[PDB]
Amino acid sequence: MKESARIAYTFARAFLMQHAPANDYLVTSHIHLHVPEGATPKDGPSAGCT
Amino acid sequence: TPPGVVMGLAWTAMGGSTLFVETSLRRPQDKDAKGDKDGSLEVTGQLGEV
């Protein structure tokens, strides 16, 4: 899940640069996140697109 | 055979077979361009011990 999350953060920064260049949060802003638990780890990246 | 995959013979428990072993990047290199942290490998495919 952390690999999915770091991949998510990276693609989020890149996509925001592609779509809203003026926006500057993700490039230079710390962000707490929380994913509710319950899902089995093998399916756990299923939420990554979310 | 796109680069990063290679074919290989294997003696499966019933008969021979032709594997195509896969090898590809799992996460972008750029933790930081200056980063010295090693790229530890992470095998998959139900590794045993040997």
Curated annotation (Swiss-Prot), chain A:
Tissues/organs with expression: Duodenum, heart, lung and liver, but not thymus.
Active-site residues (renumbered): 46
Cell compartment(s), UniProt: Mitochondrion matrix
Associated disease: CODAS syndrome: A rare syndrome characterized by the combination of cerebral, ocular, dental, auricular, and skeletal features. These include developmental delay, craniofacial anomalies, cataracts, ptosis, median nasal groove, delayed tooth eruption, hearing loss, short stature, delayed epiphyseal ossification, metaphyseal hip dysplasia, and vertebral coronal clefts.
Subunit structure: Homohexamer. Organized in a ring with a central cavity. The ATP-binding and proteolytic domains (AP-domain) form a hexameric chamber, while the N-terminal domain is arranged as a trimer of dimers. DNA and RNA binding is stimulated by substrate and inhibited by ATP binding. Interacts with TWNK and mitochondrial DNA polymerase subunit POLG.
UniProt remark on domains: The Lon N-terminal domains are crucial for the overall structure of the protein, maintaining it in a conformation allowing its proper functioning.
Function: ATP-dependent serine protease that mediates the selective degradation of misfolded, unassembled or oxidatively damaged polypeptides as well as certain short-lived regulatory proteins in the mitochondrial matrix. Endogenous substrates include mitochondrial steroidogenic acute regulatory (StAR) protein, DELE1, helicase Twinkle (TWNK) and the large ribosomal subunit protein MRPL32/bL32m. MRPL32/bL32m is protected from degradation by LONP1 when it is bound to a nucleic acid (RNA), but TWNK is not. May also have a chaperone function in the assembly of inner membrane protein complexes.
Family: Belongs to the peptidase S16 family.
Name of this chain's protein: Lon protease homolog, mitochondrial
Curated annotation (Swiss-Prot), chain B:
Compartment annotation: Mitochondrion matrix
Complete-protein stretch covered: 760 to 809 of 959
Domain of life according to the entry: Eukaryota
Self-association and partners: Homohexamer. Organized in a ring with a central cavity. The ATP-binding and proteolytic domains (AP-domain) form a hexameric chamber, while the N-terminal domain is arranged as a trimer of dimers. DNA and RNA binding is stimulated by substrate and inhibited by ATP binding. Interacts with TWNK and mitochondrial DNA polymerase subunit POLG.
Stated name of the protein: Lon protease homolog, mitochondrial
Assigned protein family: Belongs to the peptidase S16 family.
Gene name linked to the record: LONP1
Job description of the protein: ATP-dependent serine protease that mediates the selective degradation of misfolded, unassembled or oxidatively damaged polypeptides as well as certain short-lived regulatory proteins in the mitochondrial matrix. Endogenous substrates include mitochondrial steroidogenic acute regulatory (StAR) protein, DELE1, helicase Twinkle (TWNK) and the large ribosomal subunit protein MRPL32/bL32m. MRPL32/bL32m is protected from degradation by LONP1 when it is bound to a nucleic acid (RNA), but TWNK is not. May also have a chaperone function in the assembly of inner membrane protein complexes.
UniProt disease link: CODAS syndrome: A rare syndrome characterized by the combination of cerebral, ocular, dental, auricular, and skeletal features. These include developmental delay, craniofacial anomalies, cataracts, ptosis, median nasal groove, delayed tooth eruption, hearing loss, short stature, delayed epiphyseal ossification, metaphyseal hip dysplasia, and vertebral coronal clefts.
Chain ranges passing through the membrane: none
Entry note about domains: The Lon N-terminal domains are crucial for the overall structure of the protein, maintaining it in a conformation allowing its proper functioning. The AP-domain (ATP-binding and proteolytic domains) has a closed-ring conformation in the presence of AMP-PNP and its N-terminal entry gate appears closed. Upon ADP binding, it switches to a lock-washer conformation and its N-terminal gate opens.
